[PDB]
Design a protein around this ligand. Structure first.
Ligand SMILES: *C(N)CNC(=O)[C@@H]1CCCC[C@H]1CS(=O)(=O)c1ccc(OC)cc1
Length: 215
């Protein structure tokens, strides 16, 4: 297991997106994970559609929030998810309009990382690829993050309110971190990314609700 890895450099990560004023973070986190596995299995990197999930996952609440596991389960039973091109993102709750002719991938279930275990999360990222994770992103310090490894003692490990994508991990100036892809546009953080403290007692609850799809 490498001490550092960045899947962006391997071509497993699509450009940073902007969810807008819709609580669809769970959909973006879910598609990012699927995009990573699709690349690993087919060699092709394509943008999958979060709107497909927002509109069709009946177990989630669309722009009102949802779980990534429910998203993977929908893709499995639906036997597919459309490409962004075939089901563009509008940031609004609308009726399910899944188009089978636009299917770009599918999945056959998901696996969850044991709750609170950052070590298992590290092993998963190294062996499988990008992993979907949930965190507390309610702090002002998070909203205005600009550089360095983020850590705020005020972050809650129990108040999970946002979903992002762990695309790697490493160390910066002696501080271990997780490389996180957010969905608030490129103008946020460091070109849409944030480095979050790793092995600092599950900061912000990073390993409390992690999962990845199986293909
Ligand atoms: C993202 N922009 C909005 N946040 C979320 O959807 C959170 C993702 C991680 C897990 C917790 C979500 C918030 S919630 O606990 O209020 C929620 C969970 C499940 C839902 O429906 C099934 C709806 C909201």
């Amino acid at each position: 297991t490498p001490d550092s890895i960045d899947y962006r450099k391997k071509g497993y990560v699509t450009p940073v997106k902007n969810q807008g004023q819709c609580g669809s973070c769970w959909a973006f986190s879910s598609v990012g994970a699927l995009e990573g596995q699709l690349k690993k299995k087919t060699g092709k990197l394509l943008n999958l559609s979060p709107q497909n999930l927002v509109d069709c996952v009946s177990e989630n609440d669309g722009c009102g929030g949802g779980y990534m596991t429910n998203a993977f389960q929908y893709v499995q039973r639906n036997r597919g998810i459309d490409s962004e091109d075939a089901y563009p993102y509008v940031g609004q709750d609308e009726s399910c309009m899944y188009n089978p002719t636009g299917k770009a991938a599918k999945c056959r279930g998901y696996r969850e990382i044991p709750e609170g275990n950052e070590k298992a999360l590290k092993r998963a990222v190294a062996r499988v690829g990008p992993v979907s994770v949930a965190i507390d992103a309610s702090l002002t310090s998070f909203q205005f993050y600009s550089k360095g490894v983020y850590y705020d003692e005020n972050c809650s490990s129990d108040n999970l309110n946002h979903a992002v994508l762990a695309v790697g991990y490493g160390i910066q100036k002696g501080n271990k971190h997780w490389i996180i892809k957010n969905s608030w546009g490129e103008s946020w953080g460091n070109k849409g990314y944030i480095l979050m403290a790793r092995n600092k007692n599950n900061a912000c609850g990073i390993a409390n609700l992690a999962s990845f799809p199986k293909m």
